[PDB]
Symmetry: D2
Subunit: 208 residues, 4 copies
């Protein structure tokens, strides 16, 4: 049993992206006899697809849990759906701002996450971790990778389960925001890491 967890590099002017550390912290660990692989993806259209595809083909995980930062969100959010569209509010790390363009021409308009999202949310709550189901992962890189992963599952047969989890800013990222005229919500890195571990465990238990 193999699990792939991905995170993203910093973007949008931020010095850090907490999901990058999550991926690195979880890489190489084992939950039961399941092997976990952690990989960081670039916040760049096209290149992110190349890396994701190569990683999926290399590892061939049974479960894929893609993690990303969601500025402004106040709790852990589990994405219910991936949409076949790109409409960036901001450009990617290479200055590309793609608007109204499909991710995969001719492919389904959307894919539902195949992770047991409701069970994951329930377990997180039991652990005192606020979490909810998000109905839009945006139309930037998070949705981009979420869709491609689910499409890979639908066309290649693996991973069996795929989904996306967004985390809020971590406290240290809020400091420079103060004075700039706003105080966005934040959540500790420790809670985020535990949340992802819980998601993996629940997904695994689901696959038996």
């Amino acid at each position: 049993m193999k699990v792939l967890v991905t995170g993203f590099e910093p973007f949008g002017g931020e010095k850090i992206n907490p999901t990058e550390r999550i991926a690195k912290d979880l890489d190489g660990i084992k939950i039961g006899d399941a092997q976990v692989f952690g990989r960081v993806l670039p916040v760049v259209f096209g290149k992110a697809k190349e890396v994701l595809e190569k990683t999926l083909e290399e590892i061939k995980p049974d479960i894929a849990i893609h993690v990303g930062l969601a500025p402004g969100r106040s709790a852990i959010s589990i994405e219910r759906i991936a949409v076949n569209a790109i409409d960036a509010r901001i450009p990617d790390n290479e200055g590309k701002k793609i608007e109204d363009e499909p991710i995969v021409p001719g492919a389904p308009t959307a894919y539902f996450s195949t992770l047991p999202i409701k069970k994951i949310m329930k377990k997180l709550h039991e652990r005192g971790i606020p979490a909810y189901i998000s109905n839009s992962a945006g139309l930037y890189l998070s949705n981009y990778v979420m869709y491609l992963s689910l499409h890979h599952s639908a066309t290649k047969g693996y991973p069996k389960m795929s989904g996306f989890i967004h985390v809020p800013y971590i406290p240290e990222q809020i400091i420079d925001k103060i004075g700039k005229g706003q105080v966005p919500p934040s959540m500790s890195y420790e809670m985020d890491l535990e949340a992802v571990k819980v998601a993996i465990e629940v997904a695994l238990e689901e696959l038996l």
Copy 2:
């Protein structure tokens, strides 16, 4: 050198108030040779004044740091001013909803906190703790105690420094909020506790 830290009991239907635990956790500890006393106050007009007055007279602290819960706030907030007014949006724990009434008839319309609020905010930031200066502690029990404490200082000569710190909901308090149609910001109890300890240390260093 003596420091008094207060917290509040649960109110507004909440099962817990994180500041109650903060007070209990800090009671009896020492920062350097300074003795810290932690006391919990009732969320009841009148009675809260009795308890506060008695506590202040009993301990005669050099520094008083009153802590409270601020539902909806996203980071640690240090109150800049206490206002001589009561206008409760909700009733206190005994069903009393006082509207447009002074706290102390004839006393000053307001008192500025005497804690080194800017230095405290700066130190918190250096510790990676998001914090900002609040210009209104509301007109409920937090402001009530903040004003009475500062008034005590002005009329009795002690405590030398007095102020108020509000903390966001802690994560576990958000669980039942989910589904109710909203996900308020939250901050870990551990961060809150450390923030209060930092405030105490900075206040002490200020008094020398």
Copy 3:
């Protein structure tokens, strides 16, 4: 050329739903030689489908613009996608709270709105009307009708264009909210009405 505009009846305890008036105000009007029909839909699962289906079959509009109230939103929002799922945060007007259930079993996971959403947004901006593209119409009745309308288009060939527009609370709906501990954003009814008229005109110009 025929255009169908729908609105919803009051729900969630609200005395009014501004979209109900929008539908009635636009019913019978003409934009050029295009005939506009305005109909009000019940905020009830099942029944809403019956009414929508019957209305679509009766009128056979070339363009369908469904309007609804989005409590909390601050500006006009044009829905980009309809999702094949029902997961009500609150029950409908008949007390039914459907959770994790498809709208049409076996049908596509989602449909993109076929209204020229970007052009509509642009024209609204030129008119000084704040508007943006929403990537989730929720999973309540608004999404329910949006999906069914787009599904009707895909399977029956009409309407040629279908989409959904959400409007904020109108000012009068905020009054009772004040004191309840919150002041949600609002937008004038007049602006909402004009926004819908603009959307219709742009959609029509698109069909030529």
Copy 4:
């Protein structure tokens, strides 16, 4: 009976300030036999004080209602208190960003508005105008003028009543905000103007 209404010039990069038009629109009008004077103030520390002082001495109004723009607020807000402090989050129109400095050294820490704020709020509600009581007018120019006006009343005996009213962005100011990654609340200029007229009428009726 004379009434002075003030507004502010554009600031913070905005092309307009709706309160500037409010002042000009109300200048010269009469409510009953009361004469209303409308004046625009610069968003500049020091200079704003000069203009305010000169205006107050020139007109010697019985009632002074200062109006300002509050970016982000969703409804009309009536300020309850003015604070003797300056701590600008942004610089004024001349690049001056004053931090932790009193407005009037030695003067009271704060002054309560002498306008019948609760009655004004009630009348606005009866007119279908969402409005609430604000407990902080910020520590920028709005608070600056509010405090100086109330201080003038306390030391000079006039105006008899003084207060501050903040209005949200008007819709047209939101357009350029869209895409920038946020849609702030807004309220029509017409509603703002009526709200100020209502405040004046209620204040006048209070003075008899």
